[PDB]
Amino acid sequence: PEAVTKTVTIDASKYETWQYFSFSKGEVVNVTDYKNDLNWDMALHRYDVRLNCGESGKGKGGAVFSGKTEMDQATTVPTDGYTVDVLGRITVKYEMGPDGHQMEYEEQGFSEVITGKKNAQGFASGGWLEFSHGPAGPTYKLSKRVFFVRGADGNIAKVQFTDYQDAELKKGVITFTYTYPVK
Amino acid sequence: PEAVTKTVTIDASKYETWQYFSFSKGEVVNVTDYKNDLNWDMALHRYDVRLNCGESGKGKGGAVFSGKTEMDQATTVPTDGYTVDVLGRITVKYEMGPDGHQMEYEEQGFSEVITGKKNAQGFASGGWLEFSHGPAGPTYKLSKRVFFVRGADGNIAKVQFTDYQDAELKKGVITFTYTYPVK
């Protein structure tokens, strides 16, 4: 199989569910027992990313950071050391308005490599999306970190996330480009 | 009056109230009608800072950033341009439950110069404290920015905030040093 590149946007704005994605199909797929299903490679929920490995599934998944922020510079693919998913805090319900919010969370599996490591309130650093500071107030910045990501069957995608909101600034609409399979 | 320097720690961990402080007295003072009370100069709430001016009070207060991060470098005191408090989102209740929480907000006066400008999720930038990237997860970091701050009567303090939590990591326990009055 030759390396195919696709740019994908997925609406992961809902808090209650994840959007499951197949590298080989290039499509969102329906998943009803994610921990025992090899038909998905990566899942998205808000700014969280899950892989089919570790605490999130029974597959051969995992992820590394290439050290690059340009996909065209990440040309050597590692053969080992694809860190697997761990448990962390996921927001599963969020009600908000001008006067307050109420939220609920669950401990679930996710990829710290891609998501970043979370603080006690679930905000993350070191992955695809970072807090950024400037005089107009803090924003999210795309880190542009380029990941290598094993899918459920172990074949590797090169993945870079490039947006976290749509053109109307609806948050949790995620865009990424991936090239798959690579070796 | 000669310039006096004091290091102060105030427990501003409660969400429901502000801690009001007098520069001249070097002490916390009790305040109810804060918008009509010249006996306070600076108030603390969590990581928020309020001055007796603008949307927060009828006084002659306000603030500037000196451009310095060392108090001993901020030796020329501006005579004009002390920005006054504006309205923004203040968290006035936080209630934890076993698997989630609830927060309530109010729009109140605060100093953007010292607090930082807030985004739509309430994170501030450009003031004394910034929620920021790190390899173990995101954390608040001290900017060490040195401010000049007019009190209610217009007399100026040099102020630098140097901690946001106590030794047990209790959040919202604020340490600052100030020198007052300066000209």
Numbering used by the authors:
A (entry chain F), B (entry chain A): 34 to 216
Question: What wording appears in the published article?
Answer:
Our crystallographic studies have revealed a unique β-fold in the HmuY–heme protein structure and confirmed bis-histidine heme ligation. To further characterize P. gingivalis HmuY, we successfully solved its 3D structure in apo-form. Compared with holo-HmuY, one can see the opening up of the heme-binding pocket in the apo-form. The loop containing the axial heme ligand, His166, has moved significantly and the His166 side chain faces the surface of the apo-protein (the His166NE2 atom is shifted from the heme by approximately 16 Å). This loop must close up when the heme group enters the pocket. The opening up of the heme-binding pocket observed in the crystal structure of apo-protein was reproduced by MD. We experimentally verified that heme binding was accompanied by a movement of the loop carrying the His166 residue. Previously, using UV-visible spectroscopy with a single beam spectrophotometer, we estimated the Kd of heme binding under oxidizing conditions to the HmuY protein to be approximately 0.25 × 10−8 M. Here we carried out a more thorough analysis using a double-beam instrument and found that HmuY binds heme with Kd value < 10−9 M. We demonstrated that P. gingivalis HmuY not only binds free heme, but can wrest heme from methemoglobin directly and thus functions similar to typical secreted hemophores, which are engaged in heme transfer from the host hemoproteins to the outer membrane receptors.
P. gingivalis is a heme auxotroph, therefore it must acquire this compound to survive and cause efficient infection establishment. Amongst well-characterized heme acquisition systems of P. gingivalis is that encoded by the hmu operon, comprising HmuR, a typical TonB-dependent receptor involved in heme transport across the outer membrane, HmuY, a heme-binding protein, and four proteins with unknown function. The work presented here substantially extends our knowledge of P. gingivalis HmuY by presenting data on further structural characterization of this protein and novel data on a second member of P. gingivalis HmuY-like family, Tfo produced by T. forsythia. The comparative analyses of HmuY homologs suggest that not only the HmuY hemophore-like protein of P. gingivalis, but also T. forsythia Tfo may be engaged in heme acquisition.
